[PDB]
Amino acid sequence: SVGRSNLQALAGKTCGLAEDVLVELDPNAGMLAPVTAPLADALGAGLSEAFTPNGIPADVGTTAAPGINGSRARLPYNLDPARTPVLGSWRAGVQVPAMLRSGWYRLPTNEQRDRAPLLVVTAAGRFDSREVRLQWATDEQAAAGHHGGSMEFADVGAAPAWRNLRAPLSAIPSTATQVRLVADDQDLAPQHWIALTPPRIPRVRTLQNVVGAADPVFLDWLVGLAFPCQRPFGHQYGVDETPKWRILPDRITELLMRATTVASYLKDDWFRDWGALQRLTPYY
Amino acid sequence: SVGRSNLQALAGKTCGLAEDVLVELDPNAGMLAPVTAPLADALGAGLSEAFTPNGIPADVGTTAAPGINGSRARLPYNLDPARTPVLGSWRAGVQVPAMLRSGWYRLPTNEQRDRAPLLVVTAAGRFDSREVRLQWATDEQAAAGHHGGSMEFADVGAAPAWRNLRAPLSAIPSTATQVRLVADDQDLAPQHWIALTPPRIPRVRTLQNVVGAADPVFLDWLVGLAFPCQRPFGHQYGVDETPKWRILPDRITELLMRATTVASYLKDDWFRDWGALQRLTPYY
Ligand SMILES: CCCCCCCCO[C@H]1O[C@H](CO)[C@@H](O)[C@@H]1O
Ligand SMILES: CCCCCCCCO[C@H]1O[C@H](CO)[C@@H](O)[C@@H]1O
Ligand SMILES: [Ca+2]
Ligand SMILES: [Ca+2]
């Protein structure tokens, strides 16, 4: 019944699943502005206890030059290190309690058509949903150091790798004007740690609009059934060209390409790990 | 256009792709009877030059007890070693020219409904399509040591791993009564070698008939779209059960199970590597 409706829904769309996957090519464009603190400072401006810019294992790799707040952690989803502070509670050796409270970030008032209805935080590590929360506040509450309420995130994707935590904007009261992140890592097992980046509201376009019908896409035959309008990379008729994307199921390779997963969300279920879209670029 | 028709075709089937994947659970049931030689002897009864039962790398692993002709190579697709001779041209150290000509095998005269229209050989290694051929003959030709003609196989699947070579039965003349395998491995590069097992005509049932709608199946959400009638393994409503199958795209994991790929073929394109069906059993 569910299976049957899913498939009927799929076939009823001109370009199948490509119309339902929403792609966020520029996660930095959606970042919330800090209320008072400079961008570099805002992520840890409230409190940081044993959360540091390099508190993340090399293997969740590492960049030569540090990002804005000193992190050499390689960031996912084409997050720009020069515009993306990172704080994490991982460390080698002696494990200690760790906590984070960011400064306040401003929620949008200016409407934008191309936004997903989600507050998103790119995060890594292993943690329970209660350990990372989004607090909200009015101007008055924030000024007095209080918050009006809080929510948890849906943790979507495989841990401890980088992934996008999602919180439906619908849960945030309409009078809230500011939000902040709070994290609590009291679990001293070495494998239990948290890394966060600042909050954003994704600006998105459909995968069909982003990928189109001309860019060649690496994908399994099975997976391609759901993406009828995408051009499958192959060599029929002696075709020779450069693949530009790869689509993967949720759970290189001919030509030495770098594959970068781009942030994406399924319109039909914002908490579903649908699979992955990756942009391919010459490894050079 | 192709994409669109594929997807419309998919959705038009009650159980989607499950009706088009044909599964061969018992490859030994389809094995051709040798004309004159005992089963153990027939695979190398004509000529074997540097083709041996253990001429296959451990990593294409290995079994404790040898199979019928002395091979400790672990066989794929639930081939029964006690009924499946193997001969291969791989070796360490000094590389030598290698050739194989099997004895004659009898083509069926008794009709069977559940057969795929293919002559199949399970093979491993790296080789060109010209290096492995199927020869056919009438009784008269075979008796005189001649053959009436020959064909190549479609090599479907990733090399050098085990896979199923396929030759359409339609290509074999109606007067042919016997077939044999011939292989030529003159390439002395160590990575270039061939391993073969005897010819068969697969007995098959649809994946829908084999897997059904009750056995839980491990599969990616994306892949499941094409298999609407299969029960996806998960824990919704606190469901606790043992997964029995896994379906994979063409290009563990929660509970310590052994995964065994079963032989399968896509009815719509016998040369397409559609993906894989695996049977799961307790690793114990
Ligand atoms: C079983 C149908 C075989 C048709 C011939 C090759 C079909 C290729 O099929 C692939 O390409 C399509 C996208 O255009 C997509 O539906 C599928 O993954
Ligand atoms: C976007 C639709 C979300 C519906 C709620 C969960 C859907 C689960 O979807 C999975 O199960 C189906 C097989 O029954 C198959 O179509 C799909 O892979
Ligand atoms: Ca910890
Ligand atoms: Ca060789």
Numbering used by the authors:
A (entry chain A), B (entry chain A): 735 to 794, 825 to 1015, 1035 to 1067
Quote the paper.
EmbCCT crystallised in space group P6522 over a diverse range of reservoir conditions, with one molecule in the crystallographic asymmetric unit. EmbCCT is composed of two distinct subdomains, separated by a deep crevice marked by the disordered loops (residues 795–824 and 1016–1037). Soaking EmbCCT crystals in cryoprotectant solution containing 27 mM Ara(1→5)Ara-O-C8 (∼3-fold excess of ligand relative to protein concentration in the crystal) reproducibly resulted in defined ligand density, allowing us to unequivocally build one Araf unit and the octyl chain of Ara(1→5)Ara-O-C8, while the second Araf ring remained invisible, even when contouring the map at near-noise level. The soaked di-arabinofuranoside ligand is positioned between two symmetry-related copies of EmbCCT, forming non-covalent contacts only with residues in subdomain I, but not with the CBM-like subdomain II, in contrast to our expectation. The Araf moiety packs against helix H6 and the H6-S13 loop, forming three direct H-bond contacts with protein: O2 binds to carbonyl O of Trp985 (2.53 Å), O1 to Nε1 of Trp985 (2.99 Å), and O3 to Nδ2 of Asn740′ (primed residues indicating the symmetry mate). In contrast, the octyl chain binds between helix H0 and the S13–S14 loop of the symmetry mate. Ligand binding promotes ordering of the N-terminus of helix H0, where 3 additional residues become visible compared to apo, and induces a conformational shift of aspartate residues 1051 and 1052 in the S13–S14 loop.
As a first step towards the complete structural characterisation of the Emb Araf-transferases in M. tuberculosis, we have determined the crystal structure of the hydrophilic C-terminal domain of EmbC, the enzyme responsible for arabinan chain elongation in LAM synthesis and a target for the front line antibiotic EMB. The Emb enzymes of M. tuberculosis display a common architecture of 13 transmembrane helices in conjunction with a hydrophilic C-terminal domain, and share the same polyprenyl donor-substrate, β-D-arabinofuranosyl-1-monophosphoryldecaprenol (DPA). We found that the architecture of this domain comprises two subdomains, one of which folds as a lectin- or CBM-like domain, the other one shows weak similarity to the C-terminal hydrophilic domain of an unrelated GT-C glycosyltransferase, oligosaccharyl transferase STT3. The presence of a CBM-like subdomain in EmbCCT is consistent the proposed role of the C-terminal domain in acceptor substrate recognition.
